[PDB]
Nucleic acid binder design. Structure first.
Ligand SMILES: [Mg+2]
Ligand SMILES: [Mg+2]
Ligand SMILES: [Mg+2]
Ligand SMILES: [Mg+2]
Ligand SMILES: [Mg+2]
Ligand SMILES: [Mg+2]
Ligand SMILES: [Mg+2]
Ligand SMILES: [Mg+2]
Ligand SMILES: [Mg+2]
Ligand SMILES: [Mg+2]
Ligand SMILES: [Zn+2]
Lengths: 178, 57, 116, 83
RNA sequence: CUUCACACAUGCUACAAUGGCCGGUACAAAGGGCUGCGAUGCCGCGAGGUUAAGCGAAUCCUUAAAAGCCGGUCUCAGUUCGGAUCGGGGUCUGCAACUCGACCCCGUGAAGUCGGAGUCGCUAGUAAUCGCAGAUCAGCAACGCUGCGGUGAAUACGUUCC
């Protein structure tokens, strides 16, 4: 049983209810999904991301990601239509709960010069986004068998309708902000 | 489709030098993971020229 | 293993591996080892997490590491730039500041021979 | 004079001009010709038109130019990019 | 008089394992010294500072020679090679060291992996290599100059050819 989900259902829901006077119990914000994508640049060159992106995202997250191919063609990026440029996975349910717990517990503090996630990177609707720049510190992946380094980004989507509610939900969940 | 595609996701346990230990389900590593810093011990979670001239002279 | 940097070059004496951190070199590593007690001549693969965790607190107790040292350096040079002294003007022009000759040298501060 | 045995180096004919004014006010532009005098923490709020060979460069210390020198801020030579 | 988009000339440094570091360790010459040589002792990792004896000198200082030898480490790597640049902190002389001095401590640690066509010096205690001293001078010369000493080679058949 996801301990972060249990802690949420135990106290975070009540905390959000106290913070915002919702008229009904299901007006309370709740995280819907967590999405992690690559968007690699080695699409027109050497075309080798199935081992560069999928093989690490699968062990980082818990499910194999979906491959995204180019939606257009750009000469400046040497981008053609039809070849993969990015790999995206989405985490939901108890898998998302465990991934968020593991992140906030051991991964976020463990990167270089962790000074806290900026609380101003919200999209304006109640969902947050931030991303790293290298092979993350996830203990699931070790440097000894990785190719050229590549970073990743996370989109966390919540039931909240406002940025303040989203920030409060993340703070209660355990996101270290400024 | 979860037949052979997804990597293994089996119960694990995190052991930290601080002492903060919790158990979840992780990827292919089925054993333990040894860490030295956790959320309970990392920073950010627990928190003059004139003066230099004065101490110099 | 990692304290701040990689700190673990393969098959290297940790005496010299400590020099790979930003803030400790030969003498700093020697004085740290003298204080701690662990011998210099030992391969880094034999070092253990207990020794790492007693070493981790010592460096942050008095010395400094990657990131903040370079932040202090860049703050110092930036303040020197904005205050507008002779050294600050030399830094703004990229020319060496410590009175070295500029007629036939300073190729490190500038680029190689331009040959205009 | 860069030694922890005599304090800093400040000219007496400069002290007898700055200490007689800083009691009541920060004086206006002042004339000085000794670039070699150290800035004691008494020049805050004042100005010094320091000589550099041909003219006087007015220099104001706000908070930080205490370990510096008066002539440090007066370009003794002028270079303007042969090309 | 010391600038700086550039080029030349003369020297040093390296690009390493004939090596780097740690500890121990033996052998010189010639010079300098009352505006000085500072024997010891103390403080400081350190350069340096302090009180102080002997020394117009074969009796005092300089004075420890380094190359040489032993044991461990490193294992051909932009490296335990390389020390240019930069930040911080001290010492010495000088009234005054940003311009505009030298040295000491920490950290950061660039090019460089033997150098194109071409070009320089060298036949014996020579080239090669490592240290020492003087003169100028308050400080600036262990990258210049002049002398000193240690270890220490290979080639010359021949004068046609520059
Ligand atoms: Mg000249
Ligand atoms: Mg020379
Ligand atoms: Mg070395
Ligand atoms: Mg030795
Ligand atoms: Mg001592
Ligand atoms: Mg090599
Ligand atoms: Mg190179
Ligand atoms: Mg080097
Ligand atoms: Mg050649
Ligand atoms: Mg002399
Ligand atoms: Zn911990």
């Amino acid at each position: 049983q996801p301990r972060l989900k249990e802690r949420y259902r135990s106290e975070i829901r009540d905390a959000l209810r106290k913070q915002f006077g919702y008229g009904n119990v299901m007006q309370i914000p709740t995280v819907t999904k967590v999405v992690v994508n690559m968007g690699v640049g080695e699409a027109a060159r050497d075309a080798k991301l199935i081992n560069g992106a999928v093989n690490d995202l699968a062990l980082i997250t818990g499910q194999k990601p979906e491959v995204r191919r180019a939606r257009k063609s750009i000469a400046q990026f040497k981008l053609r239509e039809g070849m993969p440029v990015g790999v995206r996975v989405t985490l939901r349910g108890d898998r998302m709960w465990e991934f968020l717990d593991r992140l906030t517990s051991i991964a976020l503090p463990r990167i270089r010069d962790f000074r806290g996630l900026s609380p101003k990177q919200f999209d304006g609707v109640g969902n947050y986004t931030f991303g790293l720049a290298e092979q993350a510190v996830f203990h699931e992946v070790d440097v000894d068998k990785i190719d050229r380094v590549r970073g990743m980004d996370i989109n966390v989507v919540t039931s909240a309708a406002t940025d303040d509610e989203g920030r409060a939900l993340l703070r209660a969940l355990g996101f270290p902000f400024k | 489709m979860k037949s052979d595609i997804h990597p293994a996701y089996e119960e694990t346990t995190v052991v930290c030098g601080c002492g903060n230990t919790f158990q979840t389900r992780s990827t292919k590593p089925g054993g333990r993971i040894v860490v030295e810093v956790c959320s309970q011990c990392h920073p950010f979670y627990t928190g003059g020229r004139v003066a230099r001239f004065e101490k110099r002279y | 293993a990692r304290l701040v940097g990689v700190d673990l070059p393969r098959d290297k004496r940790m005496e010299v591996a400590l020099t790979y951190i930003f803030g400790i070199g030969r003498t700093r590593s020697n004085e740290i080892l003298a204080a701690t007690g662990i011998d210099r001549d030992l391969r880094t693969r034999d070092l253990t997490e207990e020794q790492l965790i007693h070493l981790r607190d010592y460096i942050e107790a008095n010395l400094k590491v990657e990131g903040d040292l370079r932040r202090e350096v860049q703050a110092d040079i930036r303040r020197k730039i904005e205050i507008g002294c002779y050294q600050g003007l030399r830094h703004r022009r990229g020319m060496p500041v410590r009175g070295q000759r500029t007629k036939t040298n300073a190729r490190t501060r500038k680029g190689p021979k331009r040959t205009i | 004079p860069r030694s922890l045995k005599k304090g800093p180096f400040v000219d007496e004919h400069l002290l007898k001009k700055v200490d007689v004014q800083n009691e009541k006010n920060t004086k206006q532009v002042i004339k000085t010709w000794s670039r070699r005098s150290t800035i004691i923490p008494d020049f805050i709020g004042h100005t010094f038109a320091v000589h550099d060979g041909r003219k006087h460069v007015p220099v104001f210390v706000t908070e930080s130019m205490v370990g510096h020198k008066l002539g440090e801020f007066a370009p003794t030579r002028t270079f303007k990019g042969h090309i």
